[PDB]
């Protein structure tokens, strides 16, 4: 069966979301709540996020250790994180209450299969 | 569609088999072949094979950049890399030419879908 295949990658990757372990990259809401991601995730399924990035990112060190980190404004960190979920994992099962913010994140960074989910 | 946002997602990440794009980990076959990886993905998907990576591997720097490669022995680079495919899109249509050596890799790395699928 691939869907049993399937189904554990999509739970392998869905446990990575907003983790920090490998993070090399930090998003940054209003709320001031920082937000854990993957670029390895972020380039393979949004080249506008990554080059988002990658412009508009500014460098923070930690434990001698540096991370891009972006702000992202204009967004609940619950809209944001919905997002990631979804290029981490393609889950279509998403909470109505947000279909709204994720919209103007799908259009603003090129992600054309979650305007169309959102309607 | 679900089906379709997962489909995208599966040739997503299957761009990055074996892609330096990104790439902190190296695997090097007894043919003396390099395979990148990325160890976002082999955290996620295969405790073991990360483990070994980090038990096993050795620093290694190009252009003052540093990564860990390591040895992966007594296996073909082809079976390597198909083996990396399953990590990166739990992909299970996989040649019978190679089903033998498949499974000795998913048995050491703990991989037990994949002992199933190689019958």
């Given at each position: 069966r691939t869907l049993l295949s399937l189904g554990l990658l999509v739970a392998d990757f869905g446990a990575?979301?907003?983790?920090?372990?490998?993070?090399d990259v930090q998003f940054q809401t209003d709320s001031g709540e920082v937000l854990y991601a993957h670029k390895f995730v972020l380039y393979a399924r949004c080249p506008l996020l990554i080059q988002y990035v990658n412009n508009e990112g500014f460098s923070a060190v930690e434990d001698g250790v540096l991370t891009q980190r972006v702000l992202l404004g204009d967004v609940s960190t619950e809209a944001a994180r919905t997002f990631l979920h979804y290029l981490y994992?393609?889950?279509?099962?998403?909470p109505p209450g947000l279909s709204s913010e994720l919209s103007s994140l799908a259009h603003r960074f090129g992600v054309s299969e979650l305007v169309h989910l959102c309607e």
């Open positions: 990575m979301v907003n983790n920090p372990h490998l993070s994992t393609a889950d279509t099962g998403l």
